[PDB]
Amino acid sequence: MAEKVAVLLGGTSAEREVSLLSGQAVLAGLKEAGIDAYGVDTKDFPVTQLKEQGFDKVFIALHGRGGEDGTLQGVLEFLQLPYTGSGVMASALTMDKLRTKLVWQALGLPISPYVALNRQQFETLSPEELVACVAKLGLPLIVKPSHSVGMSKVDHASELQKALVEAFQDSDVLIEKWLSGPEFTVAILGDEVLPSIRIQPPGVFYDYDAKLSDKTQYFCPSGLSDESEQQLAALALQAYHALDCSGWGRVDVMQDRDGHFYLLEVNTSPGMTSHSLVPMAARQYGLSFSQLVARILMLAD
Amino acid sequence: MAEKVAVLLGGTSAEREVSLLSGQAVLAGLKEAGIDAYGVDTKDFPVTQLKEQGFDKVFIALHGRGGEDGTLQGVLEFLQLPYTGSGVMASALTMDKLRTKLVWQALGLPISPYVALNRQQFETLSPEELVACVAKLGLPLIVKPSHESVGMSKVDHASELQKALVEAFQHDSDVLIEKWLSGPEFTVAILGDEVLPSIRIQPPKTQYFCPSGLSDESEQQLAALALQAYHALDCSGWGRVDVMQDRDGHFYLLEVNTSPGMTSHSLVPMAARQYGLSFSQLVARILMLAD
Ligand SMILES: Nc1ncnc2c1ncn2[C@@H]1O[C@H](COP(=O)(O)OP(=O)(O)O)[C@@H](O)[C@H]1O
Ligand code: NA
Ligand code: NA
Ligand code: NA
């Protein structure tokens, strides 16, 4: 009657090497807690066989494509295996920055002003009236695809059309007001919000590249005043529930010059390396790594 | 030589019986179009083995849980088989009536006034204060679980609210209370980028009218609106958008279905037929949109 637990790790995404390390750390925390867990490198073993192999429960320590995007969660729902983190809808929805924003926006949650663009709209429109479309956003701006890659900063209009030809490779592209920073991240564990962490990237984007730079620095405590922390904590929780997330995740948020926070995204299978954000926040919150993973596992049912 | 096509059908959802008819029909339409197609009852055959059995492409003719909700789509994405209809996100999002609405409201698309209630608000709030939360919506009201008849009611008087709320909350932790609309209902089939002719649905024994009776201007408006609604949720391949009118003729989006009925007497076949297509052409077009 004790559960056999698959720790899914590695995979075939560009984040494979981080995921190897996450799943390795998860596996050893689970074993420390006395969980009957086993490493499963999904690159070499088909996720569709987990049930055949005797597993009762899955801890997902994969990242990126096929790990945090709904596809693996559908496999697990098909097999009727319980698993960690968010379900099919939320896992997928969180990869789509346009629909994430629209949900948050319809709930009145704060996001930076923006304009989205289809293809049959990119094509239609004159470069010149593309800048009228965005003028109301002021300057500077960020231009990015809706699903990093093709991401770009813009300082005045002449520069815009270039960034827009990059981007459409991707029927949806986003054009938003540039925010000053700093950037913060808020880990969530079940219903509990963990201490926020301020992120300084080695200069401009905290993109995929700055998640293999040994430069990026995290601060926890973040340095926010007590009141700013409570507002950020309540906001992150709202943003997470807004998208139907469960188990655990990480909400990323950006301050602007006005001092207010703006929601960027929710990550539904965060890094779990000893150097990673959720473990960092969890330690500051008073949990050991091992307790953290035992608790994530308990939040799967 | 030719690609082999699995028509997934039947399954174990409540809709199994309808799906067997959908699939029987899809299979005959695909063979008639020249496609090398095979019926596959997913009750007996695990979808996870479609590739090892030699299938190249999948026509999805399953309905309900496990067919149109993203889980099947996830398996197929993992196997990297091309398949008909919407991807994971869209298939799953369209089962969440709350978030579907939120996405449509943020784009300025028309939906009926409503309020959302979570289980915490319930439990915390008294019957009288619940009545007050929904007073602005008037009467009558439709009460339903946010997730996809099960647990749905019509509330005609404030004193019936609590009970409707009780039932709904036994199916979900998210519940919607919506303003009743006086109708009629329409359904708009989408095929790739083409909007097919709308159908009018007259509740009672239900009557289906195609053409719908709308004027050319109204039909054109509805076609544009349906196509916006469908793109708003990231649908592709094909689908059906359900719309309703108020007494003034304004249109309101209800939902999008990402694996419609394909029986000889289903709505999408009826609209295709009015558009000039045989059922065989319809299904071949749908498959061709899968790559
Ligand atoms: N509107 C914005 N203003 C300023 N910086 C932004 C904005 N949007 C994104 N960024 C920066 O770009 C980074 C990555 O973008 P994000 O939308 O969070 O998704 P992705 O995971 O695709 O990189 C953030 O970590 C942040 O540094
Ligand atoms: Na995700
Ligand atoms: Na669906
Ligand atoms: Na009017």
Q: Hey, which CATH number is domain A1-84, 3.40.50.20, 3.30.465.10, 3.40.50.2000, 3.50.50.60?
A: 3.40.50.20
Cα gap A91→A295, rounded to integer Å:
20
Is A70 in the B-facing interface, judged by CB distances under 8 Å? yes
Q: Are A194 and A284 in contact (CB under 8 A)?
A: yes
- Is the CB–ligand 1 distance for residue A180 below 6 Å? no
**Which chain A positions have a beta carbon within 8 Å of B73's beta carbon?**
74
State yes or no: B166 annotated in a binding site. yes
Residue A263 phi/psi, 5-degree rounding, is: -80, 135
User: DSSP letter string over B172-221?
Assistant: -SEEEEEE-----EEEEEEETTEEPPPEEEE----EEESS----HHHHHH
Chain-chain contact of B71 with A88 (C-beta, under 8 angstroms): yes
Cα gap A175→A173, rounded to integer Å:
7
Structure-token pair, residue B42: 């997913």
Which of A112, A206, A215, A256 should be mutated for ligand 1, with most atoms under 8 A from CB?
A206
Burial A94-114 (b: 16+ CB within 10 A, else e): bbbbbbbbbbbbbbebebbeb
Q: Hey, which CATH number is domain B85-110+182-291, 3.30.470.20, 3.40.50.620, 3.40.50.970, 3.40.50.300?
A: 3.30.470.20
CA B248 – ligand 4 centroid, Å? 7
State yes or no: A143 annotated in a binding site. yes
Instruction: Give the torsion through C-alpha atoms of B283, A76, A26, A63, to 10 deg.
Output: 10
Residue A52 CB-density burial (10 A; 0-12 exposed, 13-18 middle, 19+ buried): exposed
Query: Distance between terminal CA atoms of chain A?
Result: 15
- Strand A4-9 relative to strand A57-60: parallel, antiparallel, unpaired? parallel
Chain-chain contact of B78 with A71 (C-beta, under 8 angstroms): yes
Structure-token pair, residue A268: 């539904």
Dmax over CA atoms of chain B, in Å, equals 69
Task: Work out the number of other CB atoms within 10 angstroms of the CB of residue A252.
Answer: 18
- Strand A248-255 relative to strand B185-191: parallel, antiparallel, unpaired? unpaired
Resolution in A: 2.3
Query: Cis peptide before B140, with omega less than 30 degrees from 0?
Result: yes
Q: Are B238 and B286 in contact (CB under 8 A)?
A: yes
Q: Hey, which CATH number is domain A85-110+180-301, 3.20.20.70, 3.30.470.20, 2.40.160.10, 3.40.50.300?
A: 3.30.470.20
Cα gap B198→A25, rounded to integer Å:
56
Structure-token pair, residue B246: 């108020």
By C-alpha distance, which of A269, A286, A93 is closest to A192? A286
What SS3 string covers chain A? Answer: CCCEEEEEECCCCCCHHHHHHHHHHHHHHHHHCCCEEEEEECCCCCHHHCCCCCCCEEEECCCCCCCCCCHHHHHHHHHCCCECCCCHHHHHHCCCHHHHHHHHHHCCCCCCCEEEECHHHHCCCCHHHHHHHHHCCCCCEEEEECCCCCCEEECCHHHHHHHHHCCCCCCCEEEEECCCCCEEEEEEECCEECCCEEEECCCCCCCCCCCCCCCCEEECCCCCCHHHHHHHHHHHHHHHHHCCCCCEEEEEEEECCCCCEEEEEEECCCCCCCCCHHHHHHHHHCCCHHHHHHHHHHCCC
Are both B1-84 and B111-181 of the same fold? no
- CA B218, chain centre distance (Å): 22
Experimental method: X-ray
Dmax over CA atoms of chain A, in Å, equals 67
Residue B288 phi/psi, 5-degree rounding, is: -65, -25
Cα gap A204→A191, rounded to integer Å:
32
**Which chain A positions have a beta carbon within 8 Å of B95's beta carbon?**
89
Strand partners, A4: A36
What is the three-class DSSP state of B288? Answer: helix
* Nearest chain A Cα distance for residue B75, angstroms: 5
Pick the ligand that lies closest to the CA of residue A92. 2
Is B73 in the A-facing interface, judged by CB distances under 8 Å? yes
Residue A281 CB-density burial (10 A; 0-12 exposed, 13-18 middle, 19+ buried): buried
Residue B164 CB-density burial (10 A; 0-12 exposed, 13-18 middle, 19+ buried): buried
CA distance readout (Å), B14 to A277, B64, B168, B281: 43, 7, 19, 28
- DSSP label of B279: H
**Across the interface, which of A74, A96, A105 has its CB nearest the CB of B234?**
A96
Match 């925010």 to its residue by tokens: A179
Give me the architecture of the B111-181 domain, per CATH. 2-Layer Sandwich (3.30)
Interface test with B, best of A75, A97, A147 (most B CBs within 10 A): A75
Interface test with A, best of B51, B89, B148, B227 (most A CBs within 10 A): B89
CATH fold for domain A111-179:
Dna Ligase; domain 1 (3.30.1490)
Cα gap A100→A106, rounded to integer Å:
10
Domain range list for chain B: 1-84, 85-110+182-291, 111-181
Structure-token pair, residue B199: 């159908």
- Is the CB–ligand 1 distance for residue A15 below 6 Å? no
